[PDB]
Curated annotation (Swiss-Prot):
Changing H12E: 1.7-fold decrease in toxicity to mice, and 0.8-fold decrease in the binding affinity for insect sodium channels. GO terms for molecular function: sodium channel inhibitor activity; toxin activity. It comes from the Eukaryota. Keywords: Cardiotoxin, Disulfide bond, Ion channel impairing toxin, Neurotoxin, Secreted, Signal, Toxin, Voltage-gated sodium channel impairing toxin. Its main location: secreted. It comes from Olivierus martensii (Manchurian scorpion). Changing R4A: 2.4-fold decrease in toxicity to mice, 15.2-fold decrease in activity on Nav1.5/SCN5A, and 43.3-fold decrease in activity on insect sodium channels. Changing R60A: Complete loss of toxicity to mice, and complete loss of affinity for insect sodium channels. Changing R4E: 2.5-fold decrease in toxicity to mice, 1.6-fold decrease in activity on Nav1.5/SCN5A, and 22.3-fold decrease in activity on insect sodium channels. Exists in two forms, due to cis-trans isomerization at 28-Pro-His-29. Negative results: has insignificant effect on Nav1.2/SCN2A. Belongs to the long (4 C-C) scorpion toxin superfamily. Sodium channel inhibitor family. Alpha subfamily. Expressed by the venom gland. This is Alpha-like toxin BmK M1.
Length: 66
């Protein structure tokens, strides 16, 4: 598939921390996702989670934020 649900990440494999769900919905949708929300707890801790984020945008993968 060309989309996936995951933490959106930058070019350094770092999540985007969040204080508001709105921040994440905006961030996710402007990058092509259908919606998003803030995770205050999750696999990698605090960060925005996007629904159906296209695969030309990075997601947090195993390893470190560098």
């Amino acid at each position: 598939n060309s989309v996936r649900d995951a933490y959106i990440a930058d070019s350094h494999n770092c999540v985007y921390e969040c204080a508001r769900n709105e921040y994440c919905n905006d961030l996710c949708t402007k990058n092509g996702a259908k919606s998003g929300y803030c995770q205050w707890v999750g696999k990698y801790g605090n960060g925005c989670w996007c629904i159906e984020l296209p695969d030309n945008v990075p997601i947090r993968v195993p390893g470190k934020c560098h």
